[PDB]
């Protein structure tokens with residue numbers, strides 16, 4: 001937010017494909033208002049959602065380190081499993097090798 | 102001008118998988134030293150690389166808007182072609198729907 005804080009050295013990217021455009025839209029609203037605040041409260045630095053097509057996108061979460069990422073994921077795995085029931089989810093994650101700006 | 106809506110950031114993700122560690126490492130070095138400085142000079146805000154597995158990762162580029170993102174992409178076909186020679190790639194891109202931090 002207002003502080004630079006930890007350098008985000010670990011990133012998790014969730015690709016999310018919903019069953020329709022309107023279901024996708026509702027999911028994004030849910031990820032903005034409930035999910036992203038929750039993971040930030042648990043240690044995430046930031047979360048962004050990028051739209052790929054009408055019913056799918058990428059949810060990108062930045063973490064200070066792998067350990068924080070693991071911590072959060074462990075805490076929310078039951079909610080993730082529920083998300084997988086309605087959606088096609090693929091999670092890809094790892095360490096930041098470089099950032100240029 | 103007055104009634105122009107907000108213009109969202111636009112994100113491009115170039116995901117790569119290489120057949121060997123050498124090709125992966127060469128690709129990372131190419132994103133860092135050739136692709137990044139070029140796109141940043143032409144209007145990208147930032148570029149980072151995230152290693153997702155032994156020989157795979159994501160190159161994530163943030164642009165101020167879609168127009169800039171598309172215009173730059175059209176000018177770096179040589180760079181895309183060079184990365185394609187050494188890797189399986191998938192490019193996914195879109196407007197940012199939200200960022201929470």
Ligand SMILES: [Cl-]
Pocket residue numbers: 012039061072073
């Ligand atoms: Cl997460």
Ligand SMILES: [Cl-]
Pocket residue numbers: 089090091
């Ligand atoms: Cl997965």
Ligand SMILES: [Cl-]
Pocket residue numbers: 113140162173174
């Ligand atoms: Cl690009």
Ligand SMILES: [Cl-]
Pocket residue numbers: 188189
């Ligand atoms: Cl292939």
